[PDB]
Design a protein around this nucleic acid. Sequence first.
RNA 1: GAAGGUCACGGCGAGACGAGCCGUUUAUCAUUACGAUAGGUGUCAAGUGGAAGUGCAGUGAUGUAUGCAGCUGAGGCAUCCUAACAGACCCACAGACUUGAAC
RNA 2: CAUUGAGAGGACCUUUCCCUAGUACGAGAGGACCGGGAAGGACGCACCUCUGGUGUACCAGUUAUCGUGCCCACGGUAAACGCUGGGUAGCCAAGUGCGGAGCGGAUAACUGCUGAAAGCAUCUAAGUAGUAAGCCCACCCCAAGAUGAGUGCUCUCCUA
RNA 3: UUCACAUCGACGGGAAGGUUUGGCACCUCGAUGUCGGCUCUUCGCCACCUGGGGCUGUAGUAUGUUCCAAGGGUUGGGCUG
RNA 4: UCGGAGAGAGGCUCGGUGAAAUAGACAUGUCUGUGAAGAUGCGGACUACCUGCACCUGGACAGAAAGACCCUAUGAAGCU
RNA 5: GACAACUCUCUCUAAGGAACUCGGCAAAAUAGCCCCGUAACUUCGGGAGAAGGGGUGCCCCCUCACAAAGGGGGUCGAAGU
RNA 6: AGGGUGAAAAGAACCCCCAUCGGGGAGUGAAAUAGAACAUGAAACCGUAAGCUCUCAAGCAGUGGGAGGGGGACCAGACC
Lengths: 121, 154, 113, 57, 116
Amino acid sequence: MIQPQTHLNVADNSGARELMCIRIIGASNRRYARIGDVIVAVIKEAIPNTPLERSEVIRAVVVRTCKELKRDNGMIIRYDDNAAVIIDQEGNPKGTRIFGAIARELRQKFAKIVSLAPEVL
Amino acid sequence: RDRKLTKPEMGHLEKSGIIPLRHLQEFRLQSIDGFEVTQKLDFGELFKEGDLVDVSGTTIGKGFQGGIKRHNFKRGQMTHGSKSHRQLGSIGAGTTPGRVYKGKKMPGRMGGTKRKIRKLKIVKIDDQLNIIMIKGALPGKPGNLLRIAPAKIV
Amino acid sequence: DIMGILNKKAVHAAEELRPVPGIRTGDIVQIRLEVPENKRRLSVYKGIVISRQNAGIHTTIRIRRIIAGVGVEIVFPLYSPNIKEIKVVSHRKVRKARLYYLRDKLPRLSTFK
Amino acid sequence: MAVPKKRTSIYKKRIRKNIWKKKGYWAALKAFSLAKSLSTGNSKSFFVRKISNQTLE
Amino acid sequence: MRHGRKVPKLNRPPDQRRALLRGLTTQLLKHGRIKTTKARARAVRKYVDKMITMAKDGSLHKRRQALGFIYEKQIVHALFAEVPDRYGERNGGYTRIIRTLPRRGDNAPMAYIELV
RNA sequence: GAAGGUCACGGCGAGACGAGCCGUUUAUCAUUACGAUAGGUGUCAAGUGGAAGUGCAGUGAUGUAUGCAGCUGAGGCAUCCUAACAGACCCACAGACUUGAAC
RNA sequence: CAUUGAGAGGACCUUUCCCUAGUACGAGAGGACCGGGAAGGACGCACCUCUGGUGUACCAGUUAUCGUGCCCACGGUAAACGCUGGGUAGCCAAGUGCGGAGCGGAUAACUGCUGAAAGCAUCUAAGUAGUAAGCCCACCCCAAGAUGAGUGCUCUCCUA
RNA sequence: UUCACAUCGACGGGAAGGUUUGGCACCUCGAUGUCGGCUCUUCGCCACCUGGGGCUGUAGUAUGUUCCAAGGGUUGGGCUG
RNA sequence: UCGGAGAGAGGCUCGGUGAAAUAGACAUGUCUGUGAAGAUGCGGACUACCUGCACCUGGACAGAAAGACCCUAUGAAGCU
RNA sequence: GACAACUCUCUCUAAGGAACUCGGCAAAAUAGCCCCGUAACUUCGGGAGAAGGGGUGCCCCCUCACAAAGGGGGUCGAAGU
RNA sequence: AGGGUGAAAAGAACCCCCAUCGGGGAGUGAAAUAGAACAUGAAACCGUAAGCUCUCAAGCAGUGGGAGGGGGACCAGACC
């Protein structure tokens, strides 16, 4: 449940550390944003020497959520703290590596993100 | 077919047997009639399997259900708000003729009423012993009647 | 559907034909189990460590809130009767505490505790 | 809340006095329970060994 | 009506129920007949029979918890050696109710509870 | 003074009050007409949880074995031992004129 | 008791991707019409067996204090269960499932054919054929209290 | 570009509708509480989007204008009352 | 933001006691138009069995208040 | 007694979190003692009870009590003002 | 605020029902369908009984025409 203005601890080295949601992209009006949906947020705290400075409007994808996600396999997936990864308008993340594991619900959208990922849940 | 009922039984002797709870009629679809045996099964031997079957159960009842429950979309505070939230949200005008715009969302009451779900595929089907498995849904709580009609997708 | 009020519990009685290894295994036990991983699937299975918080129900019994320590904080439970499941193996002897709730070992994350 | 304008009083008021019809002994038959000679209308203690009685034989 | 409702909560808080009930209970196994409303009769009914079945099993397990209900150390020993032993052959039906003439100045209900 | 309805009683995943649904101790008549609606009880499941007592180790706290024991609300099966009483009342007695098609 | 049925209301919104042709088209770039499939948002209703929430009437831990003679074992009270934690039934939700349709009758704008008056020509003035989510109908709820009070089956009463 | 009307369109004119700015101040100062927000809507039209069409200095993909049609749908925030 | 559930004091039913603002008179439906010109009682037309309970609560320019706003009456009461 | 809408006083509430609103109003939360530590500024009296942290439960031992407290050891529950 | 039963009170023994409140009779008086709420005691208001009208009909609803029905007529004569 990634509603507007929310903290998402980045899972890469794009430069950011934790951005705040701003708007959920999808249709006319997006209420919540589950894992596997792009979200436009702004960074609040970022590392100095980085390609992405603080306060910037950049898109990203949700890799982890604090909500209980469900699938057709009757399986439920959830995590401790929701996270996200910066994504370019093209569809690929600006970063190189990824942290905080990864969600299989993303392999259906972004395969590269799941590929580079260390462990898939 | 003894206790409670009495008149419906004697008024059924007309070539037939074992009376249910409520006799339901159907429409045209080319089927058997009272001249060969007078007894329909649960195989349908024609509706074809695999297809989806509709289920018309009986809705439950929440008593004098309010309006915030028949729509679920009305903001309101409670710890300090004068609307107490639960309130219908105060609907209506203040100085306008009109006619209170009848039909508009209001509390009202709730009770048993037809539902019908339509569609819904099937996973397993068995005859004789009588038993069917619907893909979830199934209107009303186990204890109604249901019509389990074929499928009026047309 | 045989007349004997056992049908509604037949689908479960016919599925419960899969005996559970650990009578209760209410402890740390880090079993991997199995996880349906399709996509390019190579007929291979993977697993993740588990913990306490063992749960269940009179119907489709549930394993337990994994809360594994791998990576960040992997959790989310699962089912055994699932079409995809492998035999369960014990890990470390059962301890003593409570089997149903445990908020600890999460905020007190450390080498001890 | 608000205030009524013209009070018809007569008629209207009278009609709203039917719902309070004479509720003759609101209860089932519970007639003679045999060997009672009368007994209260509504159901009462049955007949058998001295029961409900403060004193015995 | 609450889907699957049982045991009335009366017009008083929960703690106010497990207090008044303790009265009609002992007073029932100490005297015999107790007058009360139809609602209370149906309520106390179970709270009484469920206390009798405990004595049937004897032991101490059905005495420590039992004491949690009634406080009178006089009516407690009763069940453990008095009337419950009389129902040692009868599965249930420890209590019996019956309606009577309405209240005095008040509508209803009214009924007398007594052991069969 | 029937079918039937109503009232009451025991209840309802149905109700503000009425209505509506099931039943009323042969669990209404024949042929098995499938007729426990509730409370309690018994068993089981589930949820807590591994208690009381006792024995042992330790100065004590505490712990261990029996104990994965006991307790146990509305869930499921089973069981009517308690209360659902035998009855009443209400409602009636093949029931209008003319014409046509039949007899 | 079971239905037909005069009428009324509700539902009726919409996007992306893919196949099709990345052809036709275009110097390139860029990229269809027709038709079909899959997957969502918002919303409505129901179901809530699954994921979760409430559960001060289930149980357990436990602080201060009183009491059961006492130890032990329990009970009562403590801003609004004393605080706190979990949880069955039911009730709900961020839960689950499904319908928002297609196909027809009749049309608006427009496109039409043949052929008049104005022996050319032209949609007609006379005769016909197409035509949107509108209208009617199709799906759903109510519906002869629509007293123009219908239809069908069955039951009881023929004492003076 | 050329060419008046694909689009737009000077100098002027004729109407519809009626929510703007005013007059009137006809009925109410033995009184009918002002604005905005929130809750919940109803109807009409010269409907912005979806659909069906003509022209197009419209190749296509996308737009401009006009006609029928509203069945339906038609947003979350920063600042300010 | 979509709130839901549960525990209490009312609300609902019954028993006892037992008010009010207000009110010319009532067999006081909608709509269009009209009307000292936003009336149910006018005209046309449509719709509509008689009579309660609970609830939501726009109309009767509802109720309380011959308004504290403006003006009028060579009024009054204070102040500068 | 019943125990629905709604109103009043409250409990517990997934994800996120004031995004409500004129205004984080109303709530929630903080809120024990000891110890450690504590910025700009200062008429340098203050802010410093800033902020930000740790332990304190019970039993035993050191005294088979020096009314407390403290220092070690052991142990129970998720939580020890 | 609140007046007078009657000439004199003989302003009601006793009897019956009820909790030995209250009433009805028996009696007194020309009267208590005058008795301590008491004289003559209307209207507003609140009821019973009887005849007629009264569920498919609406708008300060009366009036003019006007059937039927319950009664009263005249040894028809068509009226109240």
